[PDB]
């Protein structure tokens, strides 16, 4: 079942429907950007649509192909955004072509927007009735000088991933630096090529036996010292 | 880079270009035929087009889908020739359906044809300004009483070929007769079967041990006499 309130479900029974409104939120905090709020249309005052107090500005956005299924391939709906004045290209050249971000689609009925969107003022406003979905941007299939097409995907979709992440190595580590297994917290001692530096900005392990010996954590080495198992 | 001369390269950028002429040469000498020169167009005097001194007779022809690529399958452009009066059928039943021949496509700008193609006489003539391509006919996909369609392919295409071309061993030889590896140059002694003969017309080798014994040439036999390695 869905988290649909009783009031909106009851309203979604009558013949004389209201106007469906779709609003989009592009979240880039996890990738290094900001939160952008878009709406396909504006109110009667020629103003950004106000919902839950926040404002969605008008911009041509169109999402097509939302197909949830359990078999076959995954779902890859398409989002089209007008690229005029180079606005999309500006963030694309900066945010690595909008790869890894999140998109949230909220759909609302017209009779529940804030009262400031209507000259008479809606008395039926209720800023808690909407339907929410989230997806992740996969690629920018085409961004011309007039438009831009993004492919969407489910966050939990598996593609190109293998289950047994463990890999057996001979003289190379397998985990990160200082994360969980390299319980190192002392001063910087080494760098990429195992040089005796003492600066923290250049401290990165070489993923070798010599790096471990330098950092005195050879007891936590991921590379088994077999090597000569296939020669004999 | 291409071998295009400077002057034609300069002319190609002009805003007011001239007509583009395409001329085709079908060479079957490697198969046992002749050289045919075709041009889709003629001059203003109703005469075959004269280029570099030779004459390309007017005849229906049209090339389509000329593509060059490095990834995926090798491109196969097509050629269409009108088969009226049975002209194509006249050589199809004689030249084994034009399989294995060569086609040469030369493109030329109209302002460089010989002076005899113009009533006033072109003064800007240069018989060494053209672009040349060569392909090989692969099959005659369509042949009717109105037209004929040929498929073209690159000479270097590696479809249906295996790299190491040796069978190592057998009861039979795996070479040619009187080549540069068999090394036989004597008089005729044997034929397709193991029958004595003394005529050069029916000199043939069964490519078995008996043939070598007949020809007193066993040290050049290309079959290792193992047999029992597979059994024992």
């Amino acid at each position: 079942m869905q988290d649909i309130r009783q009031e909106t479900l009851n309203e979604c029974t009558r013949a004389e429907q209201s106007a469906s409104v779709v609003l989009w939120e592009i979240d880039l905090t996890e990738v290094g950007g900001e939160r952008y709020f878009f709406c396909n249309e504006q109110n009667e005052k020629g103003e950004p649509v106000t919902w839950q107090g926040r404002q969605y500005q008008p911009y041509p956005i169109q999402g097509s192909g939302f197909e949830l299924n359990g078999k076959g391939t995954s779902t890859r709906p398409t989002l089209t955004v007008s690229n005029l004045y180079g606005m999309v290209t500006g963030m694309a050249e900066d945010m690595q072509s909008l790869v890894g971000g999140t998109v949230v689609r909220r759909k609302v009925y017209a009779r529940f927007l804030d009262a400031v969107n209507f000259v008479n003022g809606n008395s039926y406003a209720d800023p808690e009735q909407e339907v929410i979905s989230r997806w992740r941007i996969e690629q920018c299939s085409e961004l011309s000088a007039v438009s831009a097409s993004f492919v969407l995907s489910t966050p939990t979709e598996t593609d190109g991933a293998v289950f047994p992440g463990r890999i057996m190595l001979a003289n190379t580590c397998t985990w990160t630096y200082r994360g969980d297994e390299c319980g190192y917290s002392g001063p910087a001692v080494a760098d990429e090529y195992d040089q005796p530096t003492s600066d923290i900005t250049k401290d990165k392990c070489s993923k070798c036996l010599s790096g471990c010996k330098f950092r005195n954590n050879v007891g936590n080495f991921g590379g088994f010292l077999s090597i000569n198992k296939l020669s004999q | 880079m291409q071998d295009i001369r400077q002057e034609t390269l300069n002319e190609c950028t002009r805003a007011e270009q001239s007509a583009s002429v395409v001329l085709w040469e079908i060479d079957l000498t490697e198969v046992g035929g002749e050289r045919y020169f075709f041009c889709n167009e003629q001059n203003e005097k109703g005469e075959p087009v004269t280029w570099q001194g030779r004459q390309y007779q007017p005849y229906p022809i049209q090339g389509s889908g000329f593509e060059l690529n490095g990834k995926g399958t090798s491109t196969r452009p097509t050629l269409t020739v009108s088969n009226l009066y049975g002209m194509v059928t006249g050589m199809a039943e004689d030249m084994q359906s034009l399989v294995g021949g060569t086609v040469v496509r030369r493109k030329v700008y109209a302002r460089f044809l010989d002076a005899v193609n113009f009533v006033n006489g072109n003064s800007y003539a240069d018989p060494e300004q053209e672009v040349i391509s060569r392909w090989r006919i692969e099959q005659c996909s369509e042949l009717s009483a109105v037209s004929a369609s040929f498929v073209l392919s690159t000479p270097t295409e590696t479809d249906g070929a295996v790299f190491p071309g040796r069978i190592m061993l057998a009861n039979t030889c795996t070479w040619t007769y009187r080549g540069d590896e068999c090394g036989y140059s004597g008089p005729a002694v044997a034929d397709e079967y193991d029958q004595p003969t003394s005529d050069i017309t029916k000199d043939k080798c069964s490519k078995c041990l008996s043939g070598c014994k007949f020809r007193n040439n066993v040290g050049n036999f290309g079959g290792f006499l193992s047999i029992n390695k597979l059994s024992q």
Partner: protein, 89 residues
């Protein structure tokens, strides 16, 4: 006359990868469970094979490797390599 439907395909090719647009990438062999967990090399054959199915191979440098045996035969040897030194006792 006109030649419509160009249908640019620059986007479709990248769908399989970008490094493949400049390099065809090396082929990889399959894994046989019977051959334990060893990985087969595509350019070296240490084991000495049987001269039959395997095509006459080619060498390109170094690589102590096996072969394709054409004839194996075991008999009784002679007592003495040569010369007049032919002592037994």
């Amino acid at each position: 006359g006109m030649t419509g439907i160009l249908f640019s395909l620059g986007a479709s090719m990248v769908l399989g990868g970008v490094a493949q647009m400049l390099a065809p990438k090396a082929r990889t062999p399959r894994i046989q469970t019977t051959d334990n967990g060893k990985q087969n090399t595509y350019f070296s054959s240490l084991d000495n094979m049987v001269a039959q199915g395997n095509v006459l191979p080619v060498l390109y440098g170094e690589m102590r490797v096996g072969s394709r045996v054409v004839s194996q035969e075991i008999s009784t040897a002679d007592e003495g390599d040569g010369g007049q030194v032919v002592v037994i006792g």
